[PDB]
């Protein structure tokens, strides 16, 4: 007994499948994998493979069948991927790989990365109107998850996130932004798991906390959704009844914690919401104060962005909500994580897989009320040897902040891997994301990025390697 897809969603869906069948058809992005024990030899295979693709027999093979065949080869420690829509992009890419040159559509490394990937679940500031729609229409696993979450948020809040996603006329509010990003993050991460990927550790930021508790194995899907639903409605309601003198704003400014100590003397009502990067902090407070701080900063040519909200989460101003939040989470069952956690709620500190559960009711209270230790959890992950950070987001705003912490910590070559992007094709983005995982040697079954062969023309006679 659990809600089905509503009729309005089915109706919006058919309007959406025809808006889409009307559209001018386009070439899919196809990943071409090339690997060997040694780079030297990987380079040789690419150049050969590009010669063959330039040949008539190679020209008569669809990019798909060539990719399918490549994915069945035995994959070695030295690896490359070329990401192509047509033969000419492919060959150009492979030429770049063969010459150890650099190309946007190409990734190539000498051997695997040493530690597993950190999944970054953030979300704040990432929402945009049509987020998730294209990938829902075009991918059946993503859609299945988006629906399983839709069904649960229906049970919890009484409306449908699927209908928000499908409807070009609907923009997002405080509340619906949080549950929609949650939906999107759950079904992204499960799309990755479907293809063999898995997080070594998670780190959450704020709204992302709940999806990150689920990917960590700390809450069931039901409990995690209780966690996103309970806080989001409460902040949306709360924010609604705020006007003028009680209103507090949130803005991101290019000052560090300290630089802000030397403002927050002068401006005493100000509070720190998120420690975002070593030189970026999200603050919240009285709008005369916030505008002041912005005005100072912008004058010094320091980055600044005011956010759309009349209330400031992670501050004393959430105290009215906390008794209610507590009561709404009566009965959630926190479990022992199945992967590492850098907790930005608990000051950036790390919790080991098989540790004592952290996601109790009090976690969500402390999370909503206190600062978010985001730069700290990231500087932690780096100090412990992680270099791959992959963001599940509809637009990777958190990953840029990650860039700033990694560099400030002496890591100048992170694999910073994003998922979805505003104004970028959603299928293609995920193809890339999985192609970067493959390349860096992280878990990712590349076979699964192709449909099962229905006949011989589904393979290609790509150059052989054994004898």
């Amino acid at each position: 007994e659990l809600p089905g897809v509503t009729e309005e969603a089915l109706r919006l869906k058919e309007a959406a499948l025809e808006e889409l069948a009307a559209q001018e058809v386009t070439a899919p992005l196809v990943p071409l994998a090339v690997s060997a024990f040694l780079t030297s030899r990987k380079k040789a295979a690419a150049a050969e493979l590009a010669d063959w693709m330039q040949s008539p027999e190679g020209q008569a093979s669809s990019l798909e069948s060539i990719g399918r065949s490549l994915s069945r080869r035995n994959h070695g420690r030295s690896r490359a991927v070329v990401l192509a829509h047509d033969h000419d992009e492919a060959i150009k890419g492979l030429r770049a790989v063969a010459a150890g040159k650099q190309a946007p559509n190409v990734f190539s490394v000498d051997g695997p990365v040493t530690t597993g990937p950190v999944w970054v679940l953030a979300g704040f500031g990432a929402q945009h109107r049509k987020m998730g729609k294209s990938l829902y229409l075009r991918n059946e696993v993503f859609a299945a998850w988006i629906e399983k979450v839709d069904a649960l948020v229906q049970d919890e809040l009484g409306y449908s996130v699927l209908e928000l996603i499908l409807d070009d006329a609907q923009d997002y509010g405080i509340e619906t932004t949080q549950v929609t990003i949650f939906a999107i993050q759950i079904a992204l991460g499960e799309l990755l798991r479907h293809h063999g990927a898995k997080p070594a550790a998670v780190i959450g930021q704020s709204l992302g906390e709940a999806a990150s508790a689920y990917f960590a194995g700390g809450l069931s899907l039901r409990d995690a959704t209780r966690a996103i639903c309970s806080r989001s409605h409460l902040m949306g309601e709360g924010e609604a009844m705020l006007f003028g003198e009680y209103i507090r704003l949130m803005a991101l400014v290019e000052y560090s914690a300290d630089e802000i100590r030397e403002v927050f003397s002068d401006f005493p009502d100000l509070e720190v919401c998120v420690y975002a990067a070593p030189t970026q902090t999200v603050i919240g407070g009285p709008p005369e104060q916030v505008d002041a701080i912005l005005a100072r900063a912008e004058a010094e040519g320091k980055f600044a962005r005011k956010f759309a909200t009349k209330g400031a989460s992670h501050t004393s101003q959430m105290d009215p909500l906390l008794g209610e939040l507590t009561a709404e989470l009566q009965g959630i069952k926190p479990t022992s994580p199945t992967c590492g956690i850098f907790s930005t709620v608990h000051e950036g500190r790390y919790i080991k897989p098989g540790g004592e559960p952290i996601h109790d009711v009090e976690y969500w209270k402390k999370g909503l009320r206190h600062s978010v230790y985001f730069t700290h959890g990231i500087r932690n992950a780096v100090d412990s040897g992680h270099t791959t950070f992959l963001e599940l987001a509809p637009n990777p705003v958190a990953l840029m902040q990650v860039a700033l912490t990694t560099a400030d910590a002496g890591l100048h070559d992170a694999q910073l891997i994003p998922t979805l992007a505003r104004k970028q094709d959603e299928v293609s983005s995920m193809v890339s994301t999985m192609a970067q995982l493959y390349v860096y040697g992280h878990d990712l079954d590349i076979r699964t990025l192709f449909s099962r062969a229905s006949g011989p023309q589904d393979y290609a006679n790509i150059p052989p390697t054994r004898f």
Binding site: P104, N105, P396, L399
Partner: peptide
């Protein structure tokens, strides 16, 4: 600062 077609700082 930007992310491109395939997930790079651009």
């Amino acid at each position: 600062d930007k992310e491109n077609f395939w997930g790079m700082a651009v």
